[PDB]
Write an enzyme that holds these catalytic residues in place. Structure first.
Site, PDB file in Angstrom:
ATOM      1  CG  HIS C   5      -2.048  -1.057   1.146  1.00 31.70           C
ATOM      2  ND1 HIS C   5      -1.849  -2.266   1.780  1.00 31.70           N
ATOM      3  CD2 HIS C   5      -3.296  -1.119   0.608  1.00 31.70           C
ATOM      4  CE1 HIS C   5      -2.922  -3.029   1.622  1.00 31.70           C
ATOM      5  NE2 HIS C   5      -3.809  -2.365   0.900  1.00 31.70           N
ATOM      6  CD  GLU C  77       1.596  -2.129   3.392  1.00 34.62           C
ATOM      7  OE1 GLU C  77       0.627  -2.871   3.027  1.00 34.62           O
ATOM      8  OE2 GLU C  77       1.964  -1.150   2.727  1.00 34.62           O
ATOM      9  NE  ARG C 165     -19.324  15.073  17.722  1.00 38.25           N
ATOM     10  CZ  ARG C 165     -18.064  14.791  18.052  1.00 38.25           C
ATOM     11  NH1 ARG C 165     -17.599  13.561  17.945  1.00 38.25           N
ATOM     12  NH2 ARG C 165     -17.250  15.748  18.459  1.00 38.25           N
ATOM     13  NE  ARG C 220     -19.237  15.844  22.668  1.00 42.12           N
ATOM     14  CZ  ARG C 220     -19.583  14.570  22.416  1.00 42.12           C
ATOM     15  NH1 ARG C 220     -18.664  13.699  22.073  1.00 42.12           N
ATOM     16  NH2 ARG C 220     -20.852  14.181  22.530  1.00 42.12           N
TER      17      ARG C 220
END
Ligand SMILES: [K+]
Ligand SMILES: [K+]
Ligand SMILES: [K+]
Lengths: 250, 250, 250, 250, 250, 250
Positions: C5, C77, C165, C220
């Site tokens: 990738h 990787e 949420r 929050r």
């Protein structure tokens, strides 16, 4: 007999590879009577089996009883005898306000509120219907002008607490099922019944084709006194739909 | 922007209600260019969005990135902007001997080997595709002559241990996943990928339509040196199928 | 390329054994620019990689994308290419009233609300940071006078329902996450983000060193209109802190 | 009818509070005929019900069908009609070498390999028999000279994979159940059947008394050609025991 | 010593095969003093061991400490030394209004709210007492005219949150235990204690006989100031009951 | 007494807020004697408590007994009396070849193979040590010249099957734990003990500071006849470290 419970030999099937599987032993004769050359094969425990012919080909009609455990015995033993396609026909209670009594439900996949499905595949595996069977049921419903809904069904090991019924001996429901009906409703689930999680999981995980159709006789979300007449008519239309789907799958 | 991550306003969509959702941001322009009047809207993080026109109607193409978490953000914020139908397109590796490189896979439902699907529905709920979307993808595949397989996909939060790969830094797989590939093979599962369990669960539980198609570029069960031209042709094949399916769902 | 990738070869790294891993491909250049001889190596999908030099030694900066699945690909990787120490830098929302915008959070361990961590170790295994990495981050924060908090982080596969949420398309949250934010608050949890459970579990269970630092941009628990200026300053200080920690770990 | 499935009124029971519950509807008449004034009440689906008189008191005999789901319906609707004590009678296959064909098993508690027990109590709750019912069954077995074993039973939602049978259509058993029979053998479990986990859990958690006795007709650990006469005699033996136990519980 | 923790050799036991196992090291001497020729054998950590003689036969009395983990060490090491029958005596708090202070509870099986039971058998296996031990305890209770209750006990790894106590440092209880006491009450559970799930599971799954008796000193459902006198008398009667049960099991 | 089990008043503590918590009641006096003005406070069950003075400040030493259940009682009741910092000291068996007898282990976090930790936080929450306590233990170990390992510990509710010991009465290990030791070894886990998962979870979720240090007296991977002198010296070494760490946390 060649199998442990059903009382059938392979020769009895005369080469059949498709079975229609209702729940009630008393309803098997009604289904067989729509087809040609109906013949009663056996009656043992909850398992009543007839043979008939559809467009020149032998087909089996065999009752499962109520629940996944007895369903799993019937499906396995029929598979041992050569059956590769299984079509369930039932009646059911809807949990959505837009679904009416008289309507037909075709199930794409089921919520696994059973135990027997786990004996075939872990919970993460989907209880999904075969695409060719689902297609044949939808097309058969259209051929007689039935009002049809296609989607997800909740499949429960109980009739009472697992479907959030409180009119019982104890009057209560275990914590994990309290509030559960409203959650399934919000997620678009159409209805409750008691055998499809087992049927669909055991077939999809073993190279067997299965589908599922039901007539709506009651709706959990609006109070109404049921009419025995509308209910009888609705079961009769579901039976013709399953027979016509079978014709398309031979 | 009207949304937190994608960098899009509702005006940008010009009334669109269908989106094609590939994984790779560099594939978005190539899909959009098969349709009329293509225009780039935005690019932020792994989310690249173009608009185009199909048979006179606006459509969106938007990348998800790899995995359910970024997929769940793209699907939610597109739904906030008015999208109601989602078509996933990819390429994939098969795990059945009878499936060949160059074939096309249409997914009816997925094995839930992910975390994000649990944030929408409990494990027992099926990761099932929409019947209308699956029908359009199958009928589009037949219209162009593809060899098609229809069935169950395993959808994993990892590329390496969850797909039982041992050619890694550690060369080890955790107990829970040792022997898993052979179990899914026995159960008829076609392939592995990494976003469908999330996509299909979140849509089926919220009244949104989703489907999924992929082209087969490798097969885990047969050693073969990959051919770059054959793999490019297979990608183009699958993209033509997903555009033609969109045409049928307008 | 030597990996599937990222589009990198081992020679590209010039002997590097430490990587800084932010989420946003767009932020990689900013981090590299603080160090000596910055060079862009590759850009594929959500994975953008640069190399630079710190006190005469090569270091890698590589983006993960959003979520555990793409994080797990980048970390694996890079490990195949020789990286043994991984430092994550992010921005975050606090869930405690005593933590202010402008503060820096160093994570000792994470609540595992993800799927990919399970593909490395069963749930009972702790998502714990390396002691040398945590020490270097705390000391680097002190070196520039940052107000610092040290403790547990909740790491979620979703941005929306898993962080409780309700301002969404559906407006609801699945049962198991309803009331969850208040429970984590009572247990002393500092904040939510989306990659540390995967990062910390996969490293601690495979002999790789990892740590995690973030700047607080929102809280929050008290309503306030965010200030873009304070937010930019806070991300800049977190970037210097991660670079200085790296210096102490060479 | 006063109940939904059984087709019975409370008047039909004539004040009965004890029921004997076999699995097979064709066994109901044979059990009732050992007592005084036997009369058939109803037959619907797998539920066949007779009434009789024991030492001057009315008693019910009612079939459950195979599996916990149909068992749970029969037990609930009988409880609605006034029944407070439930005695299960069956025949079974042993999994221990020291248990011989012709022996009798009395179950103190069951391994919960079912789904319906979870709809009454969470898995941690014991599927335990009532002490008064177990005492009556043991004392009745000794009064007629039976060789008796008292202990734990494994209660499965399937006949085939959950009992680790490989002589099937697929010839495969899911990972979770591979090697399970040998584990239960090592733990002292006597036998497999399919209804006791449901029966015992639902009764113990709702203030109802239940017990279970069975005759051994086969042994999974020793190859032997079954003898039809020996098996008929063993069934009659167990039925005499369950009637004598009922006499002690009036 | 022949074992790792208890400080005993096999010769110390003089052929004993039965042990009485209380929790408190301080209570061992009291129990031994009711029998003939009492002799102290060892004191290490929470494990205090005496030997005595009952009707001419040697018997062991050994403390477990509080909790399943230390209980599992004592039971294992005594088994290594030849013990095959284990009788637990304790004191306890009832959670049913009809159970009074002064009453005796005999446990048939336990709710598994512990961790150590899982190290012997999976959760689905019942924590069930031996039928001969339960019988001997009930008969011994009758021999001195004690008011006795027979049934299910909830067995918890904590004294505080797992028994739903709120008079603590934090003043709260984790979600899964909030509301739990009222659920067990509805399901007929008699009482809470902390060792029987471990004891009963590890014995029933390994061919060892175990039983459990306790005196009621407090009732969670009605406020009352405890009387130290009634409490002392109640512990003394439970000790005579366990000794008399042992006599019947030699 | 102001608490239910420990037999202590708040006045007894003379303002102390730090406690050293060994497992063995006979080790409490030896630890206290390294400090100034040592005095015994109480001894009840497995809980023995002394007070002493370190650099002019009062400190407590209190035994936990074996396992999380008794640990959870000691920690709660000490917290009720004002203690806010808890330091565990033990000896242990290593499971890695590179760790030698005589070495010291400092635990950053634990694998949760216990039941009591679940009564404070769900499994996904990390059993992580306090950073200030871990730092003090590491710095104290270096100050006296110990060879130290810092990392993850496996914390088990049993000494025998949960640590994969086969030298037992049954000689069997339940499926779930077969092959477990080799899995933890591959994941870098240093050692087994029996109280840290409970201690660290209950403290991290309630605003209390905890750490843990242990001396290595045996190694499961290399056969060696134990040396009694070497083992006594290793215990003394670890105790000197935990006292010096306490000095740094006042
Ligand atoms: K991503
Ligand atoms: K049935
Ligand atoms: K203890």
């Amino acid at each position: 007999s060649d199998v442990f419970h059903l009382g059938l030999t392979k020769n009895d099937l005369q080469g059949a590879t498709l079975a229609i599987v209702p729940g009630d032993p008393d309803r098997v004769e009604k289904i067989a009577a729509l087809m040609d050359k109906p013949v009663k094969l056996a009656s043992h425990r909850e398992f009543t089996t007839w043979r008939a012919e559809l467009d020149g080909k032998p087909v089996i009609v065999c009752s499962t009883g109520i629940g996944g455990p007895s369903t799993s015995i019937a499906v396995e033993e029929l598979a041992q005898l050569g059956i590769r396609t299984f079509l369930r026909i039932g009646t059911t209670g809807a949990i959505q306000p837009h679904i009416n009594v008289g309507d037909v439900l075709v199930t794409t996949a089921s919520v696994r509120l059973d135990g027997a499905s786990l004996h075939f595949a872990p919970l993460e595996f989907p209880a999904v219907a075969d695409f060719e069977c689902t297609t044949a049921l939808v097309e058969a419903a259209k051929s007689i002008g039935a009002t049809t809904h296609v989607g997800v069904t909740a499949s429960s090991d109980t009739f009472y607490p697992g479907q959030e019924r409180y009119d019982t001996y104890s009057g209560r429901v275990v914590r994990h099922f309290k509030g559960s009906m409203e959650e399934w409703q919000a997620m678009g689930v159409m209805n409750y019944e008691m055998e499809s999680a087992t049927l669909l999981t055991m077939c999809a995980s073993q190279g067997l084709r299965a589908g599922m159709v039901a007539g709506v006789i009651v709706n959990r979300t609006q109070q109404e006194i049921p009419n025995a007449e509308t209910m009888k008519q609705t079961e009769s239309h579901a039976v013709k739909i399953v027979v016509e789907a079978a014709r398309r799958l031979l």
